[PDB]
Symmetry: C5
């Protein structure tokens, strides 16, 4: 089914750019939504992170895994626009010559900034709830924000590669099935696997950092680091969805 | 992406709704009353689970609660009954697309919300009549939880309503975007898991929290004053979630212009 | 929204039943006793779980129990056999809709009910002969639970029976409003989780509880008379719940007036 | 209800089974061989969990074993292979509705049972070629379990075998009454969960418990004798559930008279 | 029923493998590099869970691992890429029904096994580049386990390998026997749960166990003295399991003896 699958991606990447050109507003709103949806997955699993860490549980990371599925299922079911997702779609619509290389940069920049707006809004709204005034949920937000930015560039970059491989292969699957339940199941597996192994997702991290920098619970982060993390993780995401995933699928599916 | 397809579904749903309310009150109110009591049933369950695990000081309590809430919207979706929270996105998207009046939207909203409250009252009543809240760790969960919800700063509540109806309305958005009933239940299952466990606030459900709390004699931690104070703030937040985010957001994605 | 196409089905099934009964008392009763026995299986499984987990002092006891009862209405639905409680609403409507009579409806409720009971008795006899209720925490869980059911005030039982059959019948309502069998089961499993774990009462599962409790000679807490007290209060609650509520409501939603 | 259609379905499945033994003994035995081994896989996994959770004092042992047994009957349905248990309902229903003869049924039963036994033997052998039962609590679990089943009183095993094949068969009955492969797998998971955990007896499953426990050089307290004793009692038990309840029951429900 | 209607599918499908391999030695190898990596993704995940619960000393350890391995074959099937252990059945059953040939089998078998190999390796370096195996119970879990699997008698690894593949292949068999994708994944999860938790030996997944072990800083307790050895036993095993049993067995069930234009069963 590889050729049809290429034609599905190719065709998908043409609709992205087609969309951006007609309405920046629709395009950025679609992306804001996706950034939010992913964030909501963070709200949930950090809440859980906070709960079980306080407890002493060896199960904390496993359950955060299980619980993350809502992040990409929401994106997939809503047909909203996600950065990492597009790393592969465009990276292979481009090799198929459905879209220009610079069609592919406009999409990446807009979807990523669009996602970031979804994050900041979510974070702002999440802080108004007081759910991170203080407490273990708010210390989890704060401690995770810190470790992620205080980790070397190479470590982050490679975790970024394995994250999008997985996020992207999850999107890939949505093109290769017509069951919506298989889509959701596969998203849940790939998200379980990436969160639990310890891989880094740029757009998720926008909500981690967006929340941490809006909560007057004094952390130890600083923008330099968040931006540092987001640069490090984002390229890897690109490498993981564009290179591996994006290129491999063009390869498998192209009538040469 | 079917954004416009989607918006047209939302637009027909707002229409049929106001036709239904206009065409025949008592049906609209029975539809709503069922919704209101289906939601409440997920309170009965998750608070039984609340009282059970909290007595044990289990760290899983809220997680398991979040997990056990799916029934509330699953039932509403699969019976095709009228919930207030979902009406915030449907009517709002529908008003912008000129399918419905603003006061169509107004009526629908006030009705479901009141209809729901009626199903929550009955439920609260009948549930007290079971003696399951006569005393012990479960009564205590209803009393501590109705108290803390009603003593919370308006701002915190308001914002908690927004994040909730974003979750509820999008789980309902999903149901418009798929023809798999299992997919609907799964998505709903995920949304309610996120919003219960994350700590977001849902007016129609709080109805049953205060219904149970005000009808029960062994529950005297809250008053008929907080309940209203909670429903007002939480509901308002809910409306913002549904109309201002989902409702206007879906209208933006789908509108030919 | 399709509450008319749904009141058609409820009427159509309320009809296809009494036609079955008028045409074969034996075919009807074989189906009844099957569902009584299908329901009883979940009682066996969950009381096993009951006995294992109580004996250990898990706070999870009632929860794992709820989670594990889905088989009861699952077998019923998937084998399209006759179950009392599911009929409180299916006869409720059909008649109110003028498709079957007050006559064809007391008929269904004694047959389905007694047939069901036959299934319970036969499961009891066999399960006892497994020796699985000879000595220990499973036979203890049957003893302990059977008494508490029989020493509880009529009123509490009544109300716990209303809620049980709103959930039970709404799971049946769901099986009618969808074509996905997987979704039917998810929905059954949700409603079964919420009624068992909440503490609501089910007439037909209880037939098995007392069936097992009595036929077992290592169990001496019960007597018939107390099992009768329980069954009459619970059967009446079920009826109200499925009949006044789901019966009356769904006719009201689907009736073109 | 589509009982008539369900009973024609079984009748034609019973026809296809015998026409297939007759056509080719080897293909039938191979199919039966596969089912005994697909069932064995289950036992290997749930006995691994058996050993693990047991050596660890956990009250969830038997609950997890039941939850974990689904693969056994799932692989059988999904592979379309020939399982003794199932043939009890199908052959009988099929002979009752005058589609196959008593000799057809006895030959199917005898053949599929020996076919099943062969699969059990190979698996057991190959499993001992793992060293996973050389020593440690997984071996010890095949050891004490194999012995308690061989030493149980005949009546108890007999009745345990009835309840077991009612569950196995009603779960084959469901795969006949749905077109959804996911819903077949859920109903199988539910039924196996119920039969494993409540303590019911399954012949073909025991073949592997004895296939493993014998060939395993790490020893115990077993004897072919005891294994044979278990098998006989449990087979009779299974046959009664399968043919006398399920075969006969479904026959009475779908027969056009 | 429907075993011949099945057998045509493994048949019509053994072909298509050889075909596209004949047509694109690179289109085919990337398609195998992937599979091996999808499988390795299963290992990083469940191995992270081993470290976690093995360092906590939990009894649930091997159970939860088995319940978590599903992602491995689920991605192969859903992506429709090339995996060695699966090929065994399909290629085997392929000859028997006379659609594809012995040398093809062992070639696809040879180019399946090798596509899978890379993926473990690439994935191997990358995961170690995460520094997620520099220090700790996961780094550890990965080493020990890499030890035993090769510090284990040949006879264990062989039979632990045929069983793996009965299970791995029977899941592939089910994905041939349903048009339900959700049904596919579920049966893949049942089989992978059973096979991981019982403790059966999977070739491709060990390609990645061993990559991460060599490739690591904090080492070893290994030497390729293990690998090759371990892999060589399990594979052989894997083949038999899929080839001997599943391949020939499905042929037998499938073969309409109006051929018969050759041999007679009963
Ligand atoms: C309020 C937020 C609006 C952000 C809009 C950003 C749109 C990005 O626009 C892109 O910028 C790239 C450089 O970054 C260029 O290479 C592309 O040509 C251009 O399309
Ligand atoms: C516990 C979760 C199990 C989910 C099982 C989902 C089974 C769906 O199964 C699939 O549904 C599709 C509709 O979406 C149909 O088009 C397919 O024919 C069917 O195979």
């Amino acid at each position: 089914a590889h050729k049809e699958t290429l034609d599905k991606l190719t065709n998908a990447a043409i609709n992205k750019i087609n969309l951006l050109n007609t309405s920046k507003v629709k395009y950025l709103v679609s992306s804001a939504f996706a950034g939010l949806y992913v964030g909501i997955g963070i709200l949930l699993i950090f809440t859980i992170g906070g709960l079980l860490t306080d407890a002493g549980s060896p199960m904390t990371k496993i359950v955060m895994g299980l619980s993350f599925a809502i992040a990409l299922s929401l994106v997939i079911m809503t047909g909203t626009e996600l950065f990492a997702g597009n790393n592969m779609v465009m990276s292979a619509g481009m090799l198929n010559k459905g879209v220009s290389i610079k069609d592919t940069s406009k999409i990446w920049a807009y979807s990523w900034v669009g996602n970031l707006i979804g994050a900041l809004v979510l974070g702002i709204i999440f802080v108004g709830t007081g759910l991170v005034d203080k407490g273990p949920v708010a210390e989890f937000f704060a401690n995770t924000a810190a470790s992620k930015a205080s980790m070397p560039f190479t470590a982050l970059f490679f975790r970024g590669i394995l994250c999008n491989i997985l996020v992207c292969v999850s999107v890939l699957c949505s093109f290769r099935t017509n069951s919506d339940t298989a889509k959701i199941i596969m998203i849940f597996l790939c998200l379980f696997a990436f969160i639990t192994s310890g891989f880094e997702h740029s757009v998720a991290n926008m909500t981690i950092y967006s929340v941490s920098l809006f909560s007057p619970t004094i952390s130890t982060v600083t923008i330099g680091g968040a931006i540092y993390n987001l640069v490090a993780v984002t390229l890897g995401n690109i490498v993981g969805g564009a290179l591996f995933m994006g290129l491999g699928t063009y390869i498998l599916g192209k009538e040469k």
